[PDB]
Amino acid sequence: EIVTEEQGTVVQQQPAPAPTALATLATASTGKSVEQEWMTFFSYHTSINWSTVESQGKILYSQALNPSINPYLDHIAKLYSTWSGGIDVRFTVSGSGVFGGKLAALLVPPGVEPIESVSMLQYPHVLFDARQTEPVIFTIPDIRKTLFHSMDETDTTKLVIMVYNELINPYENGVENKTTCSITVETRPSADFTFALLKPPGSLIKHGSIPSDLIPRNSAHWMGNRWWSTISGFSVQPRVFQSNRHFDFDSTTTGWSTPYYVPIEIKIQGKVGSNNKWFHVIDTDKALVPGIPDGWPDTTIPDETKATNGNFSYGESYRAGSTTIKPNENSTHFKGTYICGTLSTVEIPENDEQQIKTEAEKKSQTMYVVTADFKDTIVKPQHKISPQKLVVYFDGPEKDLTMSATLSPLGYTLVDEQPVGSVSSRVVRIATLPEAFTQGGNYPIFYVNKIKVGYFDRATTNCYNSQILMTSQRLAEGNYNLPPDSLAVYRITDSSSQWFDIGINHDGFSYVGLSDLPNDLSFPLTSTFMGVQLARVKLASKVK
Amino acid sequence: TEEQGTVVQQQPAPAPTALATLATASTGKSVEQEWMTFFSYHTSINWSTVESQGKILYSQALNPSINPYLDHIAKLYSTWSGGIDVRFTVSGSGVFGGKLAALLVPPGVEPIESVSMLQYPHVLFDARQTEPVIFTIPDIRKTLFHSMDETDTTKLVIMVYNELINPYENGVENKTTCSITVETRPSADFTFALLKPPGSLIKHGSIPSDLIPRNSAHWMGNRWWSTISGFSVQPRVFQSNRHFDFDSTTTGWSTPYYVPIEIKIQGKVGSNNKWFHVIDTDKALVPGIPDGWPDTTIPDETKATNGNFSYGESYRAGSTTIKPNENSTHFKGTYICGTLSTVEIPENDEQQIKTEAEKKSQTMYVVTADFKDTIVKPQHKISPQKLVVYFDGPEKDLTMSATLSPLGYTLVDEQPVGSVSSRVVRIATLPEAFTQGGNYPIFYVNKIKVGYFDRATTNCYNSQILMTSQRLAEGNYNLPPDSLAVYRITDSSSQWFDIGINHDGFSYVGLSDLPNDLSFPLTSTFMGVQLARVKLASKVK
């Protein structure tokens, strides 16, 4: 027969006390009264800085009503598939009695995008003076067209904290920056706020989850998708581009490698009737795209060069110091390649053995991998990866044989001052090269790494990355969505007191509301999710 | 009496209550804690006709963990009390036969797989069940409530009363199975108490219910990064490096991760050898020893003479015998590591080195031993001085820095890597685990790239799964030093066996030897905590 949800015969057993009496003793000691206690107090949400530089009208905070606003809701929310109701707020400013300045908070209804203008104040708002101690408390109501919110919805009442009267300080002794205080925002679910239908474990969100964890909270977990190094800088450009571990908002990748740094396994061709140092790669074992090994470098060589043997060689122009660099003083042939520590072995043939065994017993050597055309005597650069454009350079065998090696990248063979991946035409476009141009007032940006250089000493050079490894992972494995003309905005803050908003777009690139970005900023960064904003609105910031 | 802060009036007001009503009308909201109005999947049990009387097919102690929702919420609280209903839905054929006994074991008592347990009050359901049986586990306690760390609670046990039997079954060595699904529903008297400050710890320590990944696909070794491929029961297990215990202590010199080894070498004029000394290292846990430096050392002594691989015909695939004498390789028991070396050209005086600086990088073969310029002696007690690298290093007075990443191993013989105390590097002491009362310790095995052979590989032992090492390292776990964190491993077949983790960090098994035919795509699930004195369960053919 048919069995419902609680259906079932209940049996009684000997060791069995009085459930109720025990329950009472607990609540007696506990003090239990309401079942959802997190609805009776304010929880720390976030904090935003307020500088003397920002002028009347700037929005220092624009976050939309979502259970995510409250740590507890955000947690329970994972069990449901629908929510509705409002959320209370308690915000306070922590400034010096010496400071001066008003702040205004207002609730904007859905279907409306805020604007950093003073006119927004000709609307009901809450006043908060920098000198106030008593926190102010109000509620972000839940205005909605639907009967209830699905988990993907983002168009909800939005709380906006704008600057009413510019913050002042009677002390102009500051150099890099005058002063600044904190604004903390606490949340408490409102009485009407309630979770709806339960969501069966492990289900997805029919329209795509809100992209709130694309960037890691701590810059210490930031690694680039070009190099496994740890992000250490940003670079604003009028056009960003990359194709390899760059993933689209829909887990799509025009590249040929996964969002993980794994060892590369290839097979090289040993040439008999010839004495060359550059070898071809027959095939690879582990690969996303049939033919191209997963993880094969993203750049090519600068110019055409003969297959002549050689080692490193740089002129006095490169020598220690900081003087101008000369691109013609680089006599390194395998310049622009990737240094890859290796573990190789050779296959000993049957009876038609000539003297391969000798070579097989040889110690492995570091291979200098790269991608480019390779005819008889010349090695031309190629920015169109293919199972036939994989070249390797090293003191390999001179006898016909097939060698297998498992190598892992560790460095780049310096070419010049320019950071790796800076030239479009030098980036291995597998077919289409994803790109992002300046838009409105926001500019695209690369994430800067640090690749170890080969000839110099404990030296390194800068490397551009289109996305942060974790972003690529999340976007590649998860199920995210992003309305038509909008982007996932995040607030990056350094250990100093500077911050700027980064807005990942659908394509996967990050933007900023600045022409340039400083480098003199304490790097133990931290980022928090702000929300989804229209891409036609210049991203906020506070640097220089 | 007074609430901190002042309520102000905003214009856009939540004033409407009808909105709520509408919400409610279209969603059908009733109760606030829906997980209390229905049973939810917990685990499944495959009752076989081979499993005899006395065997325990299920044993769980009352705890939020036995329920999906309960568990996910418990993370928010610091206190819980109350029982939980466990509903068993047996589904076999009406033609079968067999009984299953249920019993509640009070706290402070560990059950054992014996029919003695039935000389205690027990009820029993039959193999041909029609309607589900619900057993409600009482919360017997001597305290007003439970602390999130508490585990000693009432335990529900399901023992095989009468062996399952199938008539239509052949007399030939075969077997039929009767599936049973176990679900849970928190009883009415169940409740979470005080909230816990997010990020805070559990004074006494969180229950170890996540030390082994759910999928064997995420089982990397704490010795070699390759994913686990098999197990090995040994009367004694041991390891030191990258092996953590429940106190989060480590007798090793490496962290629970795999990172590049930044090293610093130095060559001197006139050296007919190729073995070098390590003078310094950047990133390091134990001052002076590079983080991640291999845990194995060279087998025997040998002159520090240049050489290449070389194995007699006793290593040709096909011979079930290997004479360790044919192996003339000098850098035996060495770890192959890709490299990226650079040279420090001294001040403007004599750039005769700029020649050795422009040379292409070589892959160094690392090991740990004592270095008397003439002969290299195997040392199992690591120290910043016993760090030794071997390759075609410069024969000129120099100081070279290198960054390597282990990729393989210089084969020595058929025996797996680190399967012998003597060859296991350590600092102070060497952690170990011996068989104790029917529970034998194990080694997690994984494959590691080898010497000059083809795409060949040899077996490598590991005391912990990389993750256990991580969790245990960065976590605040805990369990009585007389107990084990038990997990149940199930292969892609009807085979399974329990694994108990020692407080020291080693794993045990209730068998003296595990099978080979294990369909490896594995899955683990936390069972709970058991006294070590009890033989770990298992069902293997």
Next chain:
Amino acid sequence: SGVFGGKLAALLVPPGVEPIESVSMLQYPHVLFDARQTEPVIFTIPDIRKTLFHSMDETDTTKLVIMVYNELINPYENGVENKTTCSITVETRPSADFTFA
């Protein structure tokens, strides 16, 4: 066959959530019906919606999922290479409250 054994599970997934195939799905309220079930069972798929009505183009509605709860069993099952199977036919009838607008 009356000799069989096994049970299927019936779920009702809310709109706006795509179900995944996994046991974890059973950690959600569900109804069971045994293999030897006789009289047909009728599940009504309720129209849970966030709008006042539907548009002919809408597709994100409530969903009824049927999944294996307890493997199908046959006492005469000789082995793995001796698969056994029974049929289940699904039919629809518009609910009392169904309406074109």
Next chain:
Amino acid sequence: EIVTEEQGTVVQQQPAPAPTALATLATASTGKSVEQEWMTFFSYHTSINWSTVESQGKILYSQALNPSINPYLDHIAKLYSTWSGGIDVRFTVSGSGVFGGKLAALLVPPGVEPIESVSMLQYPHVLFDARQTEPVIFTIPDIRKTLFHSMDETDTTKLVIMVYNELINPYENGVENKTTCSITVETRPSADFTFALLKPPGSLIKHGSIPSDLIPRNSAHWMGNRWWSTISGFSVQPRVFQSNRHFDFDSTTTGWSTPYYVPIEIKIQGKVGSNNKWFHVIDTDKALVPGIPDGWPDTTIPDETKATNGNFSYGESYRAGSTTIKPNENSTHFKGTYICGTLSTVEIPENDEQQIKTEAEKKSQTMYVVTADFKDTIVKPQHKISPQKLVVYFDGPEKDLTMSATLSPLGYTLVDEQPVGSVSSRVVRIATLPEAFTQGGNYPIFYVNKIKVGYFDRATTNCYNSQILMTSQRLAEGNYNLPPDSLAVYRITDSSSQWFDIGINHDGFSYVGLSDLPNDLSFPLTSTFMGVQLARVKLASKVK
């Protein structure tokens, strides 16, 4: 179908009589009345001798509430796992009507260890006079902070009886004319006493049980820890220590042998051109530690000597009188080794080259086992045992023989006037050496055995032991609970009227309330468990 715990159809058997008939016949001849008959009568507990010497303050009785007090309760408690309720205690005093004096009764709360002092009387207390007639019954209430007790709990309420007013006798002639009256204490379970949850027959106890059987009843069963002889004396040292057969309350051992005395199975190697006296041990059959053989003696030679052939040779200043002893007189090269008979049996190769079989036809000889360093020329003492430092000494072979043997410790090569293992430096450690230091007023002790020597007629020397052998076996194979801050106390009573308290600490060492126990002690001793007390509490004793 579901079968409950008593479910079942009862069938009547043909050949069966009427129960009621036989039933009464029983009740009639047996006199059966109630069920827990032990609830209806006081059972002996202990007795108190109140003499005119004990002054105001002296505690004559201090019992803690615990089912163990009553032989009946104690037995029933074994089926259960929970208890709660009090226990009535009856004191029956019988002194002359001519006497005078008063005792005081206190009820100490749980969680507070009472001290012996008059200040104790500054607490509510009841008095009863020496000429009291009808017994007094004090009920020890179960004051607890938990809902019920666990069989392992011991920190309960405590009833103390102390001298309030000295005992007086008008005929008391003086101080050397002690007078005394008896008080007998009995127990009867209180109305509210109750055993709670039953425990499944084979189940194990998660929290060990109370240590009440760690020291056997009669000293006749007190075998040693180091040696197998029967204990015959004690030694109060400011620091005790041992590591071999010594066992921890956690059932752990830093030793290499089990808590039993079994024969030793080693294997001696003999090659030509090597040593013809001291030999190295190779493998072993029975062993706890992978290399070291179970039972291998835990002592080493006093000084370093050369591998020279020798025999017993003690100066005349030994057993010929009561003279002293000089370490120079004794020149027995193998001094310090353990004498132990054996069963020799050498192997024979398929091609017996040398005269091997000639040896295999030789009568086995007694070996002189020990743990020391060996470089074929010199034998130096090494307390750090290992599967290497295992050396034996005797005549042995010469050719290339692989002789296997089976030893059996019987004696010891005398060395000094001091007992065996009385020196830390000489005790074979292995990694760490367990030890127990003086603790305020409790001094650790050594159990003194009597091991046999090897030259003096039938004389023997004293051998030290860290714990009675049974104590070791039980801590080994058992599961006992004891809070480190406390120690399991035992009353040792002499064959006369002498006694002293012995407390075992968590580590496994026994203590005493004295700094030196007397020599004259009729050794047919007896023991009786008292309970668990704090370590910072001087143990009782009525010696001298």
